[PDB]
Amino acid sequence: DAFKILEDPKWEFPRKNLVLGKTLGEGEFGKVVKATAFHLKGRAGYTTVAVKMLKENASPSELRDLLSEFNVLKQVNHPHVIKLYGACSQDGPLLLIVEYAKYGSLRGFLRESRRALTMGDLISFAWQISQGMQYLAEMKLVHRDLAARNILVAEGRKMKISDFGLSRDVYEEDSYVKRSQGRIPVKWMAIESLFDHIYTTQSDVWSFGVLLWEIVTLGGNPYPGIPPERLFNLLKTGHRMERPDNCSEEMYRLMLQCWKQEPDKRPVFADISKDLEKMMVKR
Ligand SMILES: COc1ccc(-c2cnn3c(N)c(-c4ccccc4)c(NC4CCN(C)CC4)nc23)cc1OC
Ligand SMILES: [Cl-]
Ligand SMILES: [Cl-]
Numbered sequence: 001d002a003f004k005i006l007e008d009p010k011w012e013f014p015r016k017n018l019v020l021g022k023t024l025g026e027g028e029f030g031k032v033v034k035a036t037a038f039h040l041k042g043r044a045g046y047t048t049v050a051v052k053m054l055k056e057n058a059s060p061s062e063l064r065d066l067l068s069e070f071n072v073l074k075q076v077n078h079p080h081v082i083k084l085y086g087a088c089s090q091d092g093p094l095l096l097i098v099e100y101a102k103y104g105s106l107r108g109f110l111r112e113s114r115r116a117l118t119m120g121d122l123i124s125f126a127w128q129i130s131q132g133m134q135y136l137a138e139m140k141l142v143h144r145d146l147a148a149r150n151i152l153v154a155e156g157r158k159m160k161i162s163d164f165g166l167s168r169d170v171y172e173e174d175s176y177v178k179r180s181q182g183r184i185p186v187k188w189m190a191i192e193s194l195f196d197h198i199y200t201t202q203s204d205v206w207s208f209g210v211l212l213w214e215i216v217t218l219g220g221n222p223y224p225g226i227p228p229e230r231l232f233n234l235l236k237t238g239h240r241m242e243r244p245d246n247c248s249e250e251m252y253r254l255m256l257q258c259w260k261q262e263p264d265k266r267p268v269f270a271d272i273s274k275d276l277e278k279m280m281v282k283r
Contacts, residue, residue, distance in 0.1 A: 002064060005089045011074060013037065013086035013097055024104065029163070030066060031055050033065060039095055040085055048139045049085055052096040061180065063094070065165035070096055072164040080132030082152055082160040101152035101160050111219035118250070120158070120283055122215050127276035128159035128199055133208060134269035136161070137201045140170045144199050146207040146218040147188050148214040168199060191235050191261060202263035208272065209258025216247040250279060 017038040024032045050264055052069075055060055061135075072082035073096070083099040103109045104238045106125065129151060136143060143161070150163040164185055184193065190206035192198040210222055223231055223240060243252040260266045267275070270279050 001185065002060060005067065005094060007090050008074070009240075011026070011087045012090070013040070013069045013085070015092060015095075016087045018051065018095070018097065018127055020051060028207065030058070030062065031047050034100065035097070035195060037085065040097070047085070049097050049099050049246075050100045052098060053093050064096060064180075066096070067166070069163070069165040070094075072141070076136065077280065078132055080128045080133045080159050080161060081136065082162040091134070099154065099160065100165055101154035102155070103153035105146035105149055106151040106159065107154050107214065107219045109219075110148065110215065114116065114218050117218070119246070120280065123251075123279050124278060125157075125159055126212055126215050127273065127280055129161060129211065130269055130273040132159065132161040132275055133204060134273050136249075137204070137269050140169055142168045142201060143204050143207070144168060144184055145183065145188070146209055146211055148219060151211075170201065185193075186231060189223045192263060194232050194235070195256070200263060201269070202266050205258050205266045205269065205272070206263075208269075209255045212255050212258065213241060213244065216251060219245050248279075264265075 009112065017040070019036040020252040021036070021227040024034055025269070029052075032054050033051050033053070035049050036046045037049045038046045039048045052066065054066060070084070070087060071142040073082070077083065082101065084096065088095040088097070093250070109115075115206070126240075129146075133143070141162075142264075143166075145163055145166045146161070150161075153163045154160050154270075166180075181197075183205070186194070188202035188207045188210045190198075193203050213222055214220060218252070238261070242258060243249075254267075257267050258272075
């Protein structure tokens, strides 16, 4: 029975210690509300947090993605990865108590700033995300849904990689796994994911390339008006997005390297973090 949730004493939090507040956002993803949690992870007072829960019209696959995000979050801990604090899994709706990111998504944050942001700010955002990705790749995780919509902006404009429900291990550990087919946005999928359903740390690098383009265009829309079929044929014949305005030559070069046809010819996240750090310190 996939509806039965086994309690994890390490993450269980009392429902009566949690004050549910205003809705931050609701969509296909579920429902996220702002909350105050009392006596969280041993501390004496209260903590402002975000709580994710199923929507009223949630389906079994939405519960499966919420449980999957919960189990991935239990394993990771990094300053540029959204932090799990606990959960209320018994005697009521499943609630995930997570780090609160006051600015919402990076896509909305960038779009709203069209708020003064410099190129330095943009490089620093990309660099923070690359450090998180680099740590996630050493944790043997393949994110699959890296995109500006799926990254949060917390206090002090700090990037927090989020949305771990579609995350996979680089080496599949289960004897039997039922894959939820075609869940990643077409425009953020690497060429090998589009043709062969292949998702590795190198396809996360291709998605990081699309994310770079989103950051540099302040939440722009990649490949405007190109249908999935034409997009796939264009990528197959070597066509890539042109250099957008307000993007340095060195930054566009890094994007092209992320979109190389051959996965092993793309840079690794450790190289990307050093590339972005040099770009930051040059100024
Ligand atoms: C202006 O609007 C917003 C303002 C603040 C937030 C906000 C603050 N903190 N926080 C979290 N901790 C999680 C989150 C992350 C992982 C697990 C559980 C919860 C979360 N989850 C979404 C991430 C984006 N994707 C796309 C869907 C889930 N959203 C927010 C969100 C907003 O808009 C939806
Ligand atoms: Cl701030
Ligand atoms: Cl997996």
